[PDB]
Amino acid sequence: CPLMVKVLDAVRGSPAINVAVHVFRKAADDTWEPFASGKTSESGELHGLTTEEEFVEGIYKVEIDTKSYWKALGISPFHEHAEVVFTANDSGPRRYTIAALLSPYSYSTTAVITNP
Amino acid sequence: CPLMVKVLDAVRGSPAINVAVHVFRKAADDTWEPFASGKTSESGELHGLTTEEEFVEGIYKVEIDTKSYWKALGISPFHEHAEVVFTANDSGPRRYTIAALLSPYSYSTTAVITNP
Amino acid sequence: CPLMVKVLDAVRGSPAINVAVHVFRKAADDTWEPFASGKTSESGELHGLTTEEEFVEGIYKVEIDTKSYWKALGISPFHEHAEVVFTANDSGPRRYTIAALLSPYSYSTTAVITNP
Amino acid sequence: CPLMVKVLDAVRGSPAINVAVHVFRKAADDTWEPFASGKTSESGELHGLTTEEEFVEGIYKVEIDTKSYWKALGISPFHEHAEVVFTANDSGPRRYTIAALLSPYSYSTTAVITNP
Numbered sequence A, B, C, D: 001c002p003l004m005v006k007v008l009d010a011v012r013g014s015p016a017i018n019v020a021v022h023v024f025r026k027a028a029d030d031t032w033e034p035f036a037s038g039k040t041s042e043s044g045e046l047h048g049l050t051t052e053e054e055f056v057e058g059i060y061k062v063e064i065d066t067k068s069y070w071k072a073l074g075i076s077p078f079h080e081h082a083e084v085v086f087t088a089n090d091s092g093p094r095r096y097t098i099a100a101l102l103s104p105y106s107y108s109t110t111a112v113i114t115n116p
């Protein structure tokens, strides 16, 4: 699993469950080509987005639908979404975890990368 | 000053100076129109982007050029940029500080909103 | 002002007002001696804790009463407090801002240090 | 596993490996009784600190030796350590993950709690 997304909720101290996540790869045209999508599991994790062969070097965008998450909880959110844009695999394929920690008016994101 | 952007460096424990920031506003046709730009000062702050009259209700995008900041320090960071997208002034005029705290493989962002 | 503490609320997108803050300095016998205390203002900031002359080299502890802040809003938060312990002025006098960004089940803290 | 600690490195975008972690429970005397300790694994995780029977309600302190971690990497750190103090199990036993995301001049901590 070369790409995993994990979303956490800092208000409830829990995984952020059922969060929609969309992944895009920048076309050599310079626009965002759809790549994969899913919703986070009960553990806040979204696995199985891509494969080793498909996840080539490039610029990728992960869009996390934070606004829908907070609205479903009845909590006013600040952001329209949380976007993470990064270059992948430029020094060889790696296993990427993109983690996001959500609050209504703030979010954090980190990359945890491991070499298999 | 209804919109201020502040950028901090979590590696050196300092303001992030000379960071380029571009602001866009979503037009009626759903395209992003250039709204304002600038660079952070010695305090990490960017003031004077807009005025009370100009900063109407809308969806705004703040794009912080974090990659150039790290590259100038010799570092190849994870993110291409840090983008913050939000609806502004939906309940009347507010003053917004958009803060970002930067590390090579992570960033946090928060909004501090006050009622004038 | 060589030591300032700033506290922000990530749920409401606002300063965290009226947060109690206690500062201690480690004595020669390794005990924590009370150094200064105060509460955050309407801006989330606590100024005037110490002076250039008093704020000598040492190990300092800043204890932020985050639990009382959340409890007053009806929330039972995860943390009992947020503590920040650091060596100060080891390379000469500096001005320190200790910032904390609060959510019920998470907090972040950073230092912004400038040379007077 | 009722209590797990996970430590991540925001500078390298990786788990924080071999970080020393010490856990204490507040005595009814009001001082910190040693409880468990360990070092983070290659995944940045520390498992097996306690058991369901032993991890009773109480106030617990997790001390993460961040200073030694940064020193071993040759990077100047701000904090003497990162402490997380929390009340556990007051609404019944839960599975707690205490996560910490480390930078040299900043850290974050969150609790991810799941009900089995």
Ligand SMILES: COc1cc(C(=O)c2cc(O)cc(F)c2)cc([N+](=O)[O-])c1O
Pocket (backbone or CB within 6 Å): A006, A008, A097, A099, A100, A101, A108, A109, A110, A112, D006, D008, D097, D099, D100, D101, D108, D109, D110, D112
């Ligand atoms: C529950 O398990 C995990 C928790 C966490 C976090 O708490 C976290 C903390 C932050 O400050 C920021 C963030 F984006 C995530 C990160 C990972 N991870 O990355 O592998 C986990 O497996």
Ligand SMILES: COc1cc(C(=O)c2cc(O)cc(F)c2)cc([N+](=O)[O-])c1O
Pocket (backbone or CB within 6 Å): B006, B008, B097, B098, B099, B100, B101, B108, B109, B110, B111, B112, C006, C008, C097, C099, C100, C101, C108, C109, C110, C112
């Ligand atoms: C230097 O003083 C400030 C510090 C800070 C932070 O520590 C901070 C923490 C985070 O997790 C994320 C972030 F984007 C900023 C925020 C503001 N602010 O918003 O006005 C400050 O004035």
